[PDB]
Amino acid sequence: SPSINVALKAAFPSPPYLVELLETAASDNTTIYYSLLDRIAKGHFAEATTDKALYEKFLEVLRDDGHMDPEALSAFKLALSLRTATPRVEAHYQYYTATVEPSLSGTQEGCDQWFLIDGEQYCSPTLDTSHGKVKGEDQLRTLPFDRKFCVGSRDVILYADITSKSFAPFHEVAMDLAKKGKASYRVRYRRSPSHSRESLSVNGYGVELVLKRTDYALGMKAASFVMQSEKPFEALLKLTQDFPKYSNSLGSQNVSAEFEAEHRGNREVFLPEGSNVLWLNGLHLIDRQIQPFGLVDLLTRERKLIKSVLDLGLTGQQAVDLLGHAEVAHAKSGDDEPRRFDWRDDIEEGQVIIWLNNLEKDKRYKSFSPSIWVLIHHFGHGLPQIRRDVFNLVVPVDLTKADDVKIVVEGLLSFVKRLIPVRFGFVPLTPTGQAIDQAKVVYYLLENYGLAAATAYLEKSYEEQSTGQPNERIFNEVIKDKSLRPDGVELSFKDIFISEKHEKQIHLSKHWVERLRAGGDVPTVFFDGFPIPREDNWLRVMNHRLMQDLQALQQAGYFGMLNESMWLPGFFLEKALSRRNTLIFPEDKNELTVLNVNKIYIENHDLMSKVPVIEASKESTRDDWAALTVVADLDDIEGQELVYYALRFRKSNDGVRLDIVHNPKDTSRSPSVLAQRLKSREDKLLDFTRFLDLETALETGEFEPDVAYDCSLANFLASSNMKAGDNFVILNGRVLGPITSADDFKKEDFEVFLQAERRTRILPVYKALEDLGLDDKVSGPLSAAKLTSVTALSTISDLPQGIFDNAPTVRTTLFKQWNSTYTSFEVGDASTATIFFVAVINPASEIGQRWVAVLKVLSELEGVHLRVFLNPTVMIEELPVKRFYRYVLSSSPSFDESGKVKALSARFTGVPRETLLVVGMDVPPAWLVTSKVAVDDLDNLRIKDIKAKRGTEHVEAIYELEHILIEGHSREIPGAHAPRGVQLVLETENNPHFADTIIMANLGYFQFKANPGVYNIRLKEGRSSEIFTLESVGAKGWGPIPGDDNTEVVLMDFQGTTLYPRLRRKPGMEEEDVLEPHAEINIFSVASGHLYERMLNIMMASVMHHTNHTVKFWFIEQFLSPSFKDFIPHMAAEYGFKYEMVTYKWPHWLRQQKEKQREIWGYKILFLDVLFPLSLDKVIFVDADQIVRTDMYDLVEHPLDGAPYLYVVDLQRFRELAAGDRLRQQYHALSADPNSLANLDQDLPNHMQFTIPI
């Protein structure tokens, strides 16, 4: 038979089978994790014979008993076949070997499950007879895979090994520990050493067999041919795998027969040619979203969202038309559009903003008429010239730094100089020390001398030097140059420290900035109310709105409502609110942190009942109803004070379902009695005249410690990601954090939150349902809070807008709009469905085959309405599908003979015999797959040749995965600029100098090479720990979040750890990290194919014999065949030189390539300086053909001076001006259009020969 046999195997060994079940079934359920850990210590699971008969017991338990529904049993089986949760188990294997062992300083007598209590080791299960001691970085770090079994005054850990039966009692020892509310418990799994080197045969991969000789109406003959073989989903794929072979059959048995000809009312109504916008229940997907491992990690949160309302009283069809609705295009189109704000200084008392423009009284604008009607009748793309104040701008300035001062000095004084009919001004910021001392001179000069002098100093300060500490002798100049016209109050001189220039103005300078929160991560600008972020580029946001203000006001003019007696600045400040609560109206207006309120109060039977609730009385209407969750620390003066103001807020509105869950600071102080102080007097709640009435009820009530209450909280706080002591106000699911004090959210802000939330989410949730037919499932605040939390997970993109490539989640209703007949059908379960893949795929596509095979496996899920379409594209001149696919994805757990863990692989029967097929690996974008188990060729897979070469038509080549990426991106504060040049050494306690990948210009790119394990990330001592400092390596989103200062990253998945750290400057120095304050000779070369390998080899032999010195080597792993890998150490000993191998990965933002040749030149010249680590300098790549007779000394010993690089790698100049990082954006501009490169490894560096030297 003619069949290549390709399997994929992970480098890391197989985890035990019982615990693979124990993590997929009990993944995130705090309850379900410790329950499946009891049936093994009972007998049920510890009874099994083989690996088949252990999974079996799980399923019937996780269905009839009360774990999971059957429309997820098959999904459990599927993830178990794909071994998805397997790397998660290797994090415990690694934490033990790299952190648990360095503390473990004793003898394992035979105490299989040695306990960890109070920094001491106890082999004995009764505790008070030790065996060892705990060292440095304590294991009591709350790692997110040893979940919280209640809480207590002392934190305890155990390392159970379930493969051994000795775990049964030792596990039960600390089961009672947390039960009686005495201590906290968590189970971290143990390395079972009795295991074999059983390889983890990974799947979720595709097998590409490209055609090198590819170049010796078809997408319509084949298109009409699937609705002719009468197998709508099974026969669609039976073309998608071997299309390059099955092209002749498209000329035999009425293959044309244009019936789907009238079915060309598809593109001219919904979507153009040559694209596949795969729909998921309402939202749009991309490539980095539609694949194997990167898709099921997204099919469960939608599942949770949907059923949330089929309990309230709806269906899966009446949920897709409810989420993909007209009113849900407000979940995103609403928060970005801001509220009006108040900036008037007359609340401070006219003492803060200082003005450059004075439009009405200016003696430079008199040329215009002072009447209002000037703007009413105005024409042109430009601005309405007038002598009256309509527009206002306020810009804060950090006087010590030169970046913000430069703006008044230039930016503002340019718009004033260029006659803009807008009033520009600013406030002298008073935050970081010195800018306060340099703000008094600004007020001294303007009140006591005039506008000239203050501005003069500012400019003349910037032009001369830029005074860090206010300069006096340059101030004497400004005095003795403009000392005339001292209006209001007269001179003081030199030492400013009086009762006004010093006092009033600086105090009220801070009063006004705090009232509208600007001083921080975002130095926020203003303009006729509405906020403006200055975290990167302010110029765009206020300028687009600038044109939109005048035509908005013109409508009021058109109607005459604008009287001649009306102040034009105080027009946009009519709605306007006092204090901008940033928690309600964020900086980044597209970022609503909402965790489904229905998902919270539903699997926590004690915590969601023992809460002092005040229902939204049935005395009032429907839209008032809302469940303001108030989770706060009532044992603190800035946590119990918000509880009483929220209570007071309920008094005013009968639409408040109040919640007062105690969030205690003190862990030994069992929460329940504090909650019982408010649950005892819950009947007559919010009937308290003063705060003192609430403060006397928290002393009277020494209740019994209900330890059952504190354990359900330990299941809620972890799920909702919450902190203790610090507070968070919630309404229908919307978190505001970190509520430092009760001043951040007074009662006069509880209404403001109800305004915006009613506006954006509350009201439209009822309107979507009113024009639908199910308006009777809005039971009180309850349903309405579940609805306003389901529709919030629709506008939350999985990927922050501006990294991978946009991914804007938009829920619309056009997916199902297309006449559904010829190329249309709905295979699978429909009305009783859970996941709704209403799809639209074209058969002529490079990855459309992969999606046909991925969605085949997702279709096999119980209750899926995978609707399928078929748009017939025509735009092709050469072969559309140049490759032979086969997707390795299985639903029912793959099981072997006596139940062993079976291998999911790929095969090609009856495949072509006279075409070379390049075996390439298309698998999630974080897999350092390398070829290691082969005998034949990568570039050469003719079937007729191997039929003789090895003796049969079969192939026994097996590829090997060895690395799971940690791809990420670095940012900066204030400006989110690129932190490039920074050197970072990712490291564990056990493995110090491990690996280092530099930050690059493309939004601070980095990607660390590692396998499942617990890591941290250092900056190497060169320049980093002097001018740059990482506050938090953002392992938890772009955010930020008050509980993620974690400079620790742990990996145990497939897609890597998407790390978004927030590196910040040390205050002071711009001074770029990219610029300065084994052997002496080395060489690298590229290779692909057994023939390419041998022509490379003779170059290595004719380069370690001609020269009298030491030469190391640096070729690239995956391209090389296993034939070559068992060859280099041989020539490295008899000749006497050194091997070593380097490799990297093209990110999801950089132009990938089709045929494996263009790929090679991408990695060769752009990926150069990052391939080799920092502990190197000179490399001498020479093409895999030449021979070096020369002494290789006058190749390293060669002056370059400005020239970075058949080349001369100088990793000192290559890091100084970052020519590799430059060639990245150089290739980005000349790869979109193939109208610039014949080749890319010798034409990209020669185009920039004058700029980037040789």
Numbering used by the authors: 28 to 243, 292 to 1152, 1197 to 1324, 1361 to 1409
Sentences from the paper on this structure:
The enzyme selectively reglucosylates a misfolded glycoprotein on one of its N-glycans and promotes its association with the ER lectins calnexin and calreticulin, thus mediating its ER retention. Overall, UGGT's motions can be described in simple terms as two rigid groups of domains moving with respect to one another.
Both crystal structures show the TRXL3 domain tethered to the TRXL1 domain by the extra disulfide bridge. As to the UGGT clamping motion, we tested two a priori rather similar double-cysteine mutants, CtUGGTS180C/T742C and CtUGGTG177C/A786C, both designed to clamp the TRXL1-TRXL3 domains shut. Surprisingly, the two mutants differ in their ability to reglucosylate urea-misfolded bovine thyroglobulin, with the former mutant more active than (and the latter mutant having similar activity to) wild-type CtUGGT. These observations point to the possibility that each misfolded glycoprotein substrate may depend to a different degree on a different subset of UGGT inter-domain conformational degrees of freedom. The three motions are to some extent independent of each other.
